[PDB]
Amino acid sequence: YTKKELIESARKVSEKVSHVLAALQA
Amino acid sequence: MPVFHTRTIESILEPVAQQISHLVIMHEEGEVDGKAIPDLTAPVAAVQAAVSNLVRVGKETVQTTEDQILKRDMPPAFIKVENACTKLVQAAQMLQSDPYSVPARDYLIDGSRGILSGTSDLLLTFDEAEVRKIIRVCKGILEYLTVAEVVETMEDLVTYTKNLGPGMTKMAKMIDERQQELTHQEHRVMLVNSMNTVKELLPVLISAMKIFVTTKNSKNQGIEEALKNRNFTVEKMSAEINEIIRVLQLTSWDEDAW
């Protein structure tokens, strides 16, 4: 559970930063 | 863009790099301007919420870790991203103020693109310390493979086995995960084939030791043939584990440390 912790806490960052590059398909 | 070293690094960052790739190259075709400032009040909240997790867990991982190249490398990277959660939440005040800002909707095309690299760099740091822990384990087995040479007794044999088997299990386990993570087919084939050859010689090693440890209880015995055999096996298993060790080294080798 702990060795991943960094991976999952940083898969988050990537996806919420993906929702942001979203609005540029206008 | 950059170099995604694992399948899991690629899996995380890739999309949002394939995002900024199309969301960039298509802007010669004439893609017109527009916006959604309100839905930027939030995305930068959890983008500064998870850039707060990565930093957080990145703080337990910096303090709780014994690796030295980790501390001499990871905390810095907390900075790379720190400015990405800054030049984007900043693009927040260049698409709010002037909702026609050609520089603003281009400070998201960089701020975020810098949010990534701080993460691509954060992950390589950690993944490289993993590869070190694997190499240390394989060096542990190389050394213990060596004491086999000093086992003369039946309960020496039982202790040796009792101890070895679990290092083999820990090594195969790790050599298995790690391979199930490599992007080049050739490195994978090498790790897997060598790890397989060492699993196959293990029982052959212990066999010859038993014929040594018990044929040393029937005087006028064909002993030497057992030692010789013992030795070849260790020579082969050692060549193998060194092959493994090297390919891991090739794949994960240091930049800010030696």
**CATH superfamily entry for domain B1-129:** Alpha-catenin/vinculin-like (1.20.120.230)
Name the nearest CA neighbour of B36 among A11, A5, A25. Answer: A25
Give the resolution in Å: 2.7
- For residues B206 and B161, the answer to whether their CB atoms sit within 8 Å is yes
The closest CB to that of A7, out of B8, B51, B56, belongs to B8
3 state SS for chain A: CCCCHHHHHHHHHHHHHHHHCHHHCC
Judge whether B41 and B226 are in contact, CB under 8 Å: no
CA dihedral B108, B113, B114, B115 (to 10 degrees): 80
Domain residue extents for chain B: 1-129, 130-258
What is the greatest pairwise CA distance in chain B?
97
For residue B182, what are the β-bridge partners? B6
CA B182, B183, B187, B191 torsion-angle sign: positive
Closest CA to B178 of B254, B248, B255: B248
Residue B58 and residue A19: Cβ atoms within 8 Å? Answer: no
Q: How far apart are CA B212 and CA B40, in angstroms?
A: 73
Helix (H, G, I), strand (E, B) or coil at B6: strand
Asked if A26's CB is within 8 angstroms of B123's CB, the reply is no
Which CATH code for domain B130-258? 1.20.120.230
Is A19 part of the contact surface with chain B (CB cutoff 8 Å)?
yes
Q: Centre a 10 Å sphere on the Cβ of residue B208 and count the other Cβ atoms it contains.
A: 22
> B8 CB near a chain A CB, below 8 Å?
yes
Matching fold, domains B1-129 and B130-258: yes
* B203 at interface of A, judged by CB pairs closer than 8 A: no
- The verdict on a CB contact (< 8 Å) between B57 and A11 is no
Of the candidates B19, B35, B50, which has its C-beta nearest A13's C-beta?
Answer: B50
Helices B154-179 & B224-251, crossing angle to 10 degrees?
30
Q: In angstroms, rounded to a whole number, what is the distance separating the alpha carbons of residues B116 and B110?
A: 10
Give the technique used to solve this structure.
Answer: X-ray
Q: Would you state the structure tokens that stand for residue B202, as one six-digit string?
A: 């293990």
Contact B35, A19 (CB under 8 A): no
Contacts of B150 (CB under 8 A, 6+ apart): B156
* B43 close contact with A: CB closer than 8 A: yes
Residues in contact with B101: Cβ distance below 8 Å, sequence separation at least 6, in sequence order = B94, B95
